Design a protein around this nucleic acid. Structure first.
Ligand SMILES: [Mg+2]
Ligand SMILES: [Mg+2]
Ligand SMILES: [Mg+2]
Ligand SMILES: [Mg+2]
Ligand SMILES: [Mg+2]
Ligand SMILES: [Mg+2]
Ligand SMILES: [Mg+2]
Ligand SMILES: [Mg+2]
Ligand SMILES: [Mg+2]
Ligand SMILES: [Mg+2]
Ligand SMILES: [Mg+2]
Ligand SMILES: [Mg+2]
Ligand SMILES: [Mg+2]
Ligand SMILES: [Mg+2]
Ligand SMILES: [Mg+2]
Ligand SMILES: [Mg+2]
Ligand SMILES: [Mg+2]
Ligand SMILES: [Mg+2]
Ligand SMILES: [Mg+2]
Ligand SMILES: [Mg+2]
Ligand SMILES: [Mg+2]
Ligand SMILES: [Mg+2]
Ligand SMILES: [Mg+2]
Ligand SMILES: [Mg+2]
Ligand SMILES: [Mg+2]
Ligand SMILES: [Mg+2]
Ligand SMILES: [Mg+2]
Ligand SMILES: [Mg+2]
Ligand SMILES: [Mg+2]
Ligand SMILES: [Mg+2]
Ligand SMILES: [Mg+2]
Ligand SMILES: [Mg+2]
Ligand SMILES: [Mg+2]
Ligand SMILES: [Mg+2]
Ligand SMILES: [Mg+2]
Ligand SMILES: [Mg+2]
Ligand SMILES: [Mg+2]
Ligand SMILES: [Mg+2]
Ligand SMILES: [Mg+2]
Ligand SMILES: [Mg+2]
Ligand SMILES: [Mg+2]
Ligand SMILES: [Mg+2]
Ligand SMILES: [Mg+2]
Ligand SMILES: [Mg+2]
Ligand SMILES: [Mg+2]
Ligand SMILES: [Mg+2]
Ligand SMILES: [Mg+2]
Ligand SMILES: [Mg+2]
Ligand SMILES: [Mg+2]
Ligand SMILES: [Mg+2]
Ligand SMILES: [Mg+2]
Ligand SMILES: [Mg+2]
Ligand SMILES: [Mg+2]
Ligand SMILES: [Mg+2]
Ligand SMILES: [Mg+2]
Ligand SMILES: [Mg+2]
Ligand SMILES: [Mg+2]
Ligand SMILES: [Mg+2]
Ligand SMILES: [Mg+2]
Ligand SMILES: [Mg+2]
Ligand SMILES: [Mg+2]
Ligand SMILES: [Mg+2]
Ligand SMILES: [Mg+2]
Ligand SMILES: [Mg+2]
Ligand SMILES: [Mg+2]
Ligand SMILES: [Mg+2]
Ligand SMILES: [Mg+2]
Ligand SMILES: [Mg+2]
Ligand SMILES: [Mg+2]
Ligand SMILES: [Mg+2]
Ligand SMILES: [Mg+2]
Ligand SMILES: [Mg+2]
Ligand SMILES: [Mg+2]
Ligand SMILES: [Mg+2]
Ligand SMILES: [Mg+2]
Ligand SMILES: [Mg+2]
Ligand SMILES: [Mg+2]
Ligand SMILES: [Mg+2]
Ligand SMILES: [Mg+2]
Ligand SMILES: [Mg+2]
Ligand SMILES: [Mg+2]
Ligand SMILES: [Mg+2]
Ligand SMILES: [Mg+2]
Ligand SMILES: [Mg+2]
Ligand SMILES: [Mg+2]
Ligand SMILES: [Mg+2]
Ligand SMILES: [Mg+2]
Ligand SMILES: [Mg+2]
Ligand SMILES: [Mg+2]
Ligand SMILES: [Mg+2]
Ligand SMILES: [Mg+2]
Ligand SMILES: [Mg+2]
Ligand SMILES: [Mg+2]
Ligand SMILES: [Mg+2]
Ligand SMILES: [Mg+2]
Ligand SMILES: [Mg+2]
Ligand SMILES: [Mg+2]
Ligand SMILES: [Mg+2]
Ligand SMILES: [Mg+2]
Ligand SMILES: [Mg+2]
Ligand SMILES: [Mg+2]
Ligand SMILES: [Mg+2]
Ligand SMILES: [Mg+2]
Ligand SMILES: [Mg+2]
Ligand SMILES: [Mg+2]
Ligand SMILES: [Mg+2]
Ligand SMILES: [Mg+2]
Ligand SMILES: [Mg+2]
Ligand SMILES: [Mg+2]
Ligand SMILES: [Mg+2]
Ligand SMILES: [Mg+2]
Ligand SMILES: [Mg+2]
Ligand SMILES: [Mg+2]
Ligand SMILES: [Mg+2]
Ligand SMILES: [Mg+2]
Ligand SMILES: [Mg+2]
Ligand SMILES: [Mg+2]
Ligand SMILES: [Mg+2]
Ligand SMILES: [Mg+2]
Ligand SMILES: [Mg+2]
Ligand SMILES: [Mg+2]
Ligand SMILES: [Mg+2]
Ligand SMILES: [Mg+2]
Ligand SMILES: [Mg+2]
Ligand SMILES: [Mg+2]
Ligand SMILES: [Mg+2]
Ligand SMILES: [Mg+2]
Ligand SMILES: [Mg+2]
Ligand SMILES: [Mg+2]
Ligand SMILES: [Mg+2]
Ligand SMILES: [Mg+2]
Ligand SMILES: [Mg+2]
Ligand SMILES: [Mg+2]
Ligand SMILES: [Mg+2]
Ligand SMILES: [Mg+2]
Ligand SMILES: [Mg+2]
Ligand SMILES: [Mg+2]
Ligand SMILES: [Mg+2]
Ligand SMILES: [Mg+2]
Ligand SMILES: [Mg+2]
Ligand SMILES: [Mg+2]
Ligand SMILES: [Mg+2]
Ligand SMILES: [Mg+2]
Ligand SMILES: [Mg+2]
Ligand SMILES: [Mg+2]
Ligand SMILES: [Mg+2]
Ligand SMILES: [Mg+2]
Ligand SMILES: [Mg+2]
Ligand SMILES: [Mg+2]
Ligand SMILES: [Mg+2]
Ligand SMILES: [Mg+2]
Ligand SMILES: [Mg+2]
Ligand SMILES: [Mg+2]
Ligand SMILES: [Mg+2]
Ligand SMILES: [Mg+2]
Ligand SMILES: [Mg+2]
Ligand SMILES: [Mg+2]
Ligand SMILES: [Mg+2]
Ligand SMILES: [Mg+2]
Ligand SMILES: [Mg+2]
Ligand SMILES: [Mg+2]
Ligand SMILES: [Mg+2]
Ligand SMILES: [Mg+2]
Ligand SMILES: [Mg+2]
Lengths: 96, 67
RNA sequence: UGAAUGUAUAGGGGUGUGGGUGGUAACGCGGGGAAGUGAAACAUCUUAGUACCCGUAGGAAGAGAAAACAAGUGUGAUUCC
RNA sequence: GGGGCCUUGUGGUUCUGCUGCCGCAGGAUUGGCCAGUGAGAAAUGUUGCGUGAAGGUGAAGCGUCUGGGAAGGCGUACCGGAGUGGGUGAGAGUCCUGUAACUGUAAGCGUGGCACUGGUGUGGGGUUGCCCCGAGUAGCGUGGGACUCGUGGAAUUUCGCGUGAAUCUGGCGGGACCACCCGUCAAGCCUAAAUACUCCUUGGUGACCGAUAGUGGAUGAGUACCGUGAGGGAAGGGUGAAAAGUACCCCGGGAGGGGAGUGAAAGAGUUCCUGAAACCGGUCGCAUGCAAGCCGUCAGAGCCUGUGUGGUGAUGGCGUGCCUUUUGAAGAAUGAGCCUGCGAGUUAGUGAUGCGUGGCGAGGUUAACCCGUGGUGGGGGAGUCGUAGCGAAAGCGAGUCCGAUA
RNA sequence: GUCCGAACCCACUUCAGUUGAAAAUGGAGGGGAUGAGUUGUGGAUAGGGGUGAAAGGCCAAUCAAACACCGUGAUAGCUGG
RNA sequence: GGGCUUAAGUUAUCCGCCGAAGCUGUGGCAACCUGUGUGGUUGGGUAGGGGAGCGUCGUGUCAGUGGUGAAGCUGCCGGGUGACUGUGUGGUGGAGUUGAUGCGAGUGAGAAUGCAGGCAUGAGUAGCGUGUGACGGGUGGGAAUCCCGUCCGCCGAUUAUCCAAGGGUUCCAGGGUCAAGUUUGUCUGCCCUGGGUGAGUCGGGUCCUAAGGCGAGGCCGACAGGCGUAGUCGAUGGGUAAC
RNA sequence: CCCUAAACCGACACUGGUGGAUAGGUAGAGUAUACCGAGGCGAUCGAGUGAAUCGUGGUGAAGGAACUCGGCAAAAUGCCC
RNA sequence: AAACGACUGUUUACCAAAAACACAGGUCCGUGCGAAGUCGUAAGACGAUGUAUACGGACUGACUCCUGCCCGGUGCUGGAA
RNA sequence: GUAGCGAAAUUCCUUGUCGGGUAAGUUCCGACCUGCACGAAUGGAGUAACGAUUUCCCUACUGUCUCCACCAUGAACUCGGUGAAAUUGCAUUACGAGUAAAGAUGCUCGUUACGCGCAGCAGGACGGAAAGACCCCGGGACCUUUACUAUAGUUUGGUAUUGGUGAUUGGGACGGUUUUCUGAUUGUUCUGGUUAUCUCACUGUGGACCGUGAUCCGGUUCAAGGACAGUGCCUGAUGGGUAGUUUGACUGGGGCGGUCGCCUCCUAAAGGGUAACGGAGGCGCCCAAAGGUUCCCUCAGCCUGGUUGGUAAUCAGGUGGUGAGUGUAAGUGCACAAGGGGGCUUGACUGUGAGACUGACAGGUCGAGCAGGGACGAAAGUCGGGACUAGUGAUCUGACGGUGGCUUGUGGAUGCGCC
């Protein structure tokens, strides 16, 4: 920077740490679930969301931005509270 | 060969979902007694870089997504 | 054969049993090990265990058959990509 | 785990000593599951394969035209498991060498593999009283080194100096350390393959160079030459299809030339293909000895030529080089004597980041490697980017974080 | 380690040379000339080292760290292209 | 500047003209904007940004072409807005190469006190390295510079003679005059061919040791190596038989 | 065969450097110097011409350092008894 | 006649030959011998086949007359509450 | 600062002053002392002899000169032969006064000049030769030292090599004298300091002997040392002997001096901004009140009267609007007071920040409204330090307190993260 203390020295270091064993949840939304299983997907699974798109060999958390007018049984790894509430409101369920 | 990323840039700069470059505010590590609570509030946040500084940081990060 | 000397050894006298000496472009292994350079100076650091050097191979060498990994199941020598 | 202690099992035996006239071991042509020239506790002859080094066979065109010469033109046939090349007086599938295909290899120290000879040879179950399981080692301290780790919370590993253990109810590892759990059994050794390399050998290849390039080196090249020495280190390729390299004559001491011969060409004559520029001259046209010229440019008479456009240019106007570097250069700032040749934005990353363009598209894409000895094609989705963000993180999630479920 | 003075060794002054006859000389003089003299042959000391009656002198015709090769296409915010 | 007051000086005022790549007229080119029949605006330019091209070499493909003459070189006559060019026409030359469309670059030079070669400028100029030569005759294509002779001059503690070191055939005879020789050259220390060096006693070795070198074992040193004993080399010396 | 060099060391057929031996006559102390001997050379571009000028020597009236930074150079002195 | 150096010598090969170096003489410090000192990692070696009248280092520089005051600072030597 | 010496190889002033020498003497040489800034082994003062040393004088002598002339020669010059060199953007390359990068053959205005040679001379072409050495800036090298950081070497102690036995001195174990204890202890064991002994550790040494008929080396032995020394490792000191390097910039060249961040004013041209080694000053604090709030008050000066008492202390009356005052510079403010005084207090808060100001950025500044929990006030309301603007330092690294997010098999620990 010409001898002036450069930005990458004047800015303080963002401290913190990384979790050595952090796992990342592949996330699928209710919009996507409705769009890719419109005929009232009875039992969606990890393999089904993978053949659609979830980037398999990972945990397959489902989130809840959307409407989900159909009844669906997700059977996935973890889910959000709003997603679960919408699913039982529509008449479906989650497992695992 | 692969281009290494700048270590200080990795440790100091973040990239948001919309491509904004943000750093931590400077001047709050010590000598905080004379500083009012208003000054500490101004210095405790997260600052968004200017366009030129953000471009320089993005060049320094060899595609590293920031901390 | 056995000194000083006692044991005996060193040494001495035979015999010729086998091996060695030196060369070699690159690659190997073990060891010694810079500086210019970069850091816009510079000493930590870098360059780099590089250049060079010593010893020493083989057709390849080194490594190699878990006093290993793994993390809750498991994998099952080493080398190389 | 092994030894020990036993319940059994050794290849069918001639029939030897010992332990107890039980059993154990030596024994001997003979089975033999096997196993072998390997690292494997070892290493000694005869017979079965294609071949490398050399070779052998190896297809099929004449006629006309122009030419010094036919491979070219024209006509017309042939071969092809052969139309890859390279030669031949010019551009050849059938002229030559070969090529395709097949074949031979006697020989090798031959080599590889097979058979034979020949050489070498089993355990399972129970038991734990006992016995053994690699010591100046492992650890520890200290001074250094290697590990992402630059002494640190410092594991693991290593060298020097000290100190120095347990040994199965044991040792070591799982990043200080302890416990438990899981793994493992150091301080003895040997091990093919995948990997690295090319002084060499053989064959082949090139949107590689073509004599200032490519090796320093196309030639007496590591030579000439330079240096006491280590060492440094050049330059010089081309007649023609064939020397047919110019007989003989003339001027000349020769050199060289003039005739003549050879040749398609000799102004291809050896200093030899092509023969550029600087540079040096002969001849012809015009101008030029009253003139002050960055040398040009515009105007322009005359002369020459007319191949009716070109050459030259009296005389008038205007006009201070090129480059570099500079606020500013014709500058008395820098560089350039001249020509010819050479001499500086390249290349590599499944690098970073844009754009153009093409493909596919909520998907896109493979890397290594495998197959194609037939390539540029196919496989390979391990990975990787996109698919949700926010937070130091646990985590939560169209939200998240600071905050008091503000 | 006397005196004068050839050879010999030296190098004080001057002139010439200074694209020289010569990358240090020539002409004219000048100092030493039995001494710490001079010279031949062979040998010894080697680069952060040598040797030096000491000038940083000399070490193969440029020495405040020789030469050659190598690291190496060192680096140069500078100059040129 | 000439010259000017008889203004061609100063000043007020009036009427004309000259005068630029400015403006206008006319012809061509180009960029951009605009509704897209029109038209409008614009086009000096260094550093620098963007866009579109020329030429060279290699190469895929197609079309070809070439001894009835390719490349290169060199005239003339033409062409394009530029790099450049003609499918015009000769000359030289003797084996390749053109157009279209892609692909790949060792792709363009006037400068670097750039590198290599060739060649100018200074210039027929400076110099030709201490000096004494003259003449008669000869040789020869050619003579101041070769040979012979006669005069003359020079050196003479060296311009003589012989060794060592070093050089290496230069020595001798014959043939030669491209090069070399600071000129000429018939001449040469040059070139070519052939020839020439004879030792029991001379100088070295076969004998000896000095300085110093190397060094069986050995001692020392991580390695590499250092030193050194016994020894063994090493003249510049000792020893050694001819004039 | 050259060898106080045209043959060696200096890039040269280079007014430089190069160790040792022999070394006569006359004048002289002398191996200085002059002219000669033994012997060897005439030197490796010449021919001319009274230019300035530069180099190298020579002479000088009267004066005698007035020159000049300075008696620089030259002159004088010089040998033997 | 003055300055400098006592003297003969030595020195910047290639701009300085001197008043600079050396010198004989002087003083101080070290060294009892496997010396101190020096070269070397070491062994060894020089010193020296020497032994304090010797050796090494430092300064001074023939000779004559002399060489004053200061131990606070620094160094050296000795001492150790 | 003595002897001695002194305008000196030292004396700046300076050609000091006087004396000698010359017709004339900044030099000379003899004196003076006013020694800018002599001085006693970095020796002081002298000194016969010596010197291609430096300086002055006399004599002789001369072309050194007045003042040059002449002679001969090697070049020069002409003819024949041979035949370079540095240099070179160019060329048909005048002068004058101008002009221009401020010194022109080349530009302007004029003047002069037929074309070409030969021998000469050096005023110019900022002539040629050497990418100025002087200067500065960047780099390097070597040198120096009480620069920094290291190191060879030298030195200290520990420990290993390294053992035997003693005394002489301190700390416990340990019981059982004292008196668990202010004070004494002894014996039984253990452990330091110091010191002397002993000797097939070791010393590379003095003698002898052997390997051998060897000044190396080794072995045996004697003598002398002796657990010391030596060496390894660890450790403190020393260490320009050696090595790598650092040693700022600004600047009317550089050095010296001064300056470097922040605040106020002027320059600054009536917004903001605006440079100089321009002109003036301040800051690196202070205050638990000099902060918050509420209520109250008005100053300085002047005039008159008054014990001590004066120009001016305290008091009275009159006058007096800002001229006093403001913790601290200056400006802008403040008398409605932001100036003076009393009461009660801790908002010198926690979570925040709509919206703006100002910088290239880092950053700097203001801030309404809200919640929590407070202070003051009857309330309205005000309070996130101070009338305002200086009183300050990014990041890294480390530290303390809190928190408990993470922790490499698990649980701890440890480490880290957050505040
Ligand atoms: Mg800074
Ligand atoms: Mg903190
Ligand atoms: Mg705070
Ligand atoms: Mg071998
Ligand atoms: Mg370094
Ligand atoms: Mg650096
Ligand atoms: Mg740098
Ligand atoms: Mg192996
Ligand atoms: Mg296995
Ligand atoms: Mg055939
Ligand atoms: Mg035909
Ligand atoms: Mg074991
Ligand atoms: Mg361990
Ligand atoms: Mg350690
Ligand atoms: Mg490390
Ligand atoms: Mg450890
Ligand atoms: Mg763990
Ligand atoms: Mg192995
Ligand atoms: Mg070549
Ligand atoms: Mg060619
Ligand atoms: Mg060539
Ligand atoms: Mg040679
Ligand atoms: Mg023909
Ligand atoms: Mg021709
Ligand atoms: Mg030719
Ligand atoms: Mg030709
Ligand atoms: Mg005329
Ligand atoms: Mg004119
Ligand atoms: Mg300038
Ligand atoms: Mg110029
Ligand atoms: Mg000029
Ligand atoms: Mg310049
Ligand atoms: Mg030039
Ligand atoms: Mg050029
Ligand atoms: Mg996957
Ligand atoms: Mg004498
Ligand atoms: Mg001599
Ligand atoms: Mg001299
Ligand atoms: Mg001269
Ligand atoms: Mg004398
Ligand atoms: Mg020698
Ligand atoms: Mg000096
Ligand atoms: Mg030299
Ligand atoms: Mg150096
Ligand atoms: Mg390197
Ligand atoms: Mg460079
Ligand atoms: Mg320049
Ligand atoms: Mg016009
Ligand atoms: Mg116009
Ligand atoms: Mg117009
Ligand atoms: Mg334009
Ligand atoms: Mg225009
Ligand atoms: Mg441009
Ligand atoms: Mg044809
Ligand atoms: Mg071509
Ligand atoms: Mg093409
Ligand atoms: Mg090029
Ligand atoms: Mg060119
Ligand atoms: Mg050239
Ligand atoms: Mg010429
Ligand atoms: Mg002439
Ligand atoms: Mg001339
Ligand atoms: Mg001339
Ligand atoms: Mg001449
Ligand atoms: Mg001559
Ligand atoms: Mg002659
Ligand atoms: Mg004759
Ligand atoms: Mg004579
Ligand atoms: Mg004589
Ligand atoms: Mg010979
Ligand atoms: Mg011959
Ligand atoms: Mg010869
Ligand atoms: Mg001869
Ligand atoms: Mg000739
Ligand atoms: Mg002849
Ligand atoms: Mg002859
Ligand atoms: Mg012998
Ligand atoms: Mg000897
Ligand atoms: Mg040996
Ligand atoms: Mg002998
Ligand atoms: Mg001998
Ligand atoms: Mg002779
Ligand atoms: Mg000679
Ligand atoms: Mg020679
Ligand atoms: Mg006589
Ligand atoms: Mg003589
Ligand atoms: Mg004679
Ligand atoms: Mg002779
Ligand atoms: Mg000659
Ligand atoms: Mg004449
Ligand atoms: Mg005379
Ligand atoms: Mg006369
Ligand atoms: Mg006279
Ligand atoms: Mg007279
Ligand atoms: Mg007189
Ligand atoms: Mg005078
Ligand atoms: Mg005068
Ligand atoms: Mg004189
Ligand atoms: Mg004289
Ligand atoms: Mg005196
Ligand atoms: Mg004096
Ligand atoms: Mg003297
Ligand atoms: Mg003296
Ligand atoms: Mg002398
Ligand atoms: Mg000498
Ligand atoms: Mg000299
Ligand atoms: Mg002495
Ligand atoms: Mg010693
Ligand atoms: Mg000795
Ligand atoms: Mg002295
Ligand atoms: Mg004292
Ligand atoms: Mg003292
Ligand atoms: Mg002391
Ligand atoms: Mg005076
Ligand atoms: Mg004075
Ligand atoms: Mg006087
Ligand atoms: Mg004294
Ligand atoms: Mg003194
Ligand atoms: Mg003094
Ligand atoms: Mg003295
Ligand atoms: Mg004295
Ligand atoms: Mg005297
Ligand atoms: Mg002298
Ligand atoms: Mg006189
Ligand atoms: Mg002449
Ligand atoms: Mg001539
Ligand atoms: Mg002017
Ligand atoms: Mg003028
Ligand atoms: Mg003019
Ligand atoms: Mg002109
Ligand atoms: Mg002339
Ligand atoms: Mg002339
Ligand atoms: Mg001139
Ligand atoms: Mg000049
Ligand atoms: Mg110079
Ligand atoms: Mg310069
Ligand atoms: Mg220089
Ligand atoms: Mg430096
Ligand atoms: Mg140097
Ligand atoms: Mg010690
Ligand atoms: Mg000790
Ligand atoms: Mg004792
Ligand atoms: Mg004893
Ligand atoms: Mg004793
Ligand atoms: Mg130093
Ligand atoms: Mg230093
Ligand atoms: Mg460095
Ligand atoms: Mg600086
Ligand atoms: Mg200044
Ligand atoms: Mg400066
Ligand atoms: Mg303003
Ligand atoms: Mg304004
Ligand atoms: Mg400004
Ligand atoms: Mg108040
Ligand atoms: Mg506070
Ligand atoms: Mg806001
Ligand atoms: Mg502020
Ligand atoms: Mg509140
Ligand atoms: Mg209240
Ligand atoms: Mg206040
Ligand atoms: Mg207040
Ligand atoms: Mg830092
Ligand atoms: Mg793990
Ligand atoms: Mg907080």
């Amino acid at each position: 920077a010409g001898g002036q203390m450069p930005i990458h020295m004047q800015a303080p270091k963002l401290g913190g740490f990384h979790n050595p064993f952090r796992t990342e949840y592949q996330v699928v939304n209710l919009d996507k679930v409705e769009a890719l299983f419109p005929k009232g997907g009875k039992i969606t699974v990890d393999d089904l969301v993978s053949v659609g798109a979830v980037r398999d060999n990972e945990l397959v958390k489902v989130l809840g931005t959307g409407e989900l007018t159909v009844k669906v049984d997700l059977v996935v790894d973890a889910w959000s509270k709003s997603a679960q509430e919408k699913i039982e409101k529509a008449g479906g369920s989650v497992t695992k | 060969p692969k281009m290494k990323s700048h270590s200080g840039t990795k440790k100091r700069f973040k990239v948001t979902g919309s491509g904004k470059v943000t750093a931590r505010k400077a001047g709050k590590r010590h000598l905080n007694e004379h500083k009012s609570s208003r000054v500490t509030r101004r210095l405790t946040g997260e600052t968004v870089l200017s366009k030129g500084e953000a471009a320089k940081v993005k060049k320094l990060l060899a595609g590293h997504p920031g901390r």
